[PDB]
DNA sequence: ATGAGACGCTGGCGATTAGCTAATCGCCAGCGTCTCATCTTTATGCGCC
């Protein structure tokens, strides 16, 4: 609930999360997706930009080209 | 018109009585896993101001 720094899950509601309600008080959308952008990097010429996934085909017509 | 001033075995024992760190070495050290994802980075391979 905002009290460590390894947390990234976020909160539907203001509950204590239990078995039966985990599933409405978690919101398990944003949790994964904080999850996963929290690791990505950015790009070192355009710093606060994110990068593309890699099987972008924008990408690989960049690269094939 | 007299009655104070002058003070010991201790030292050298035993024998209680009491009490304390230190030097040497040996032992022996919580650890087991998996999942999941996440990023990097390296070996090789391709380009001239």
Same mark, same amino acid.
Do not use: C
């Given at each position: 609930?905002?009290? +460590? &720094?390894?947390? !990234?899950?976020? &909160? ?7 078995? !039966? ?9 944003? +949790? ?5 952008? &929290? ?19 924008? *990408?690989?017509?960049?690269?094939? *080209?």
């Amino acid at each position: 609930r905002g009290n +460590s &720094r390894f947390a !990234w899950m976020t &909160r539907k509601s203001e509950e204590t999360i239990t078995p !039966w309600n985990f599933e409405e008080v978690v919101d398990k959308g944003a +949790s994964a997706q904080s999850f996963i952008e &929290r690791m990505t990097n950015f790009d070192k010429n355009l710093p606060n930009e994110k990068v593309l996934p890699k099987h972008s085909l924008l *990408y690989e017509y960049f690269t094939v *080209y």
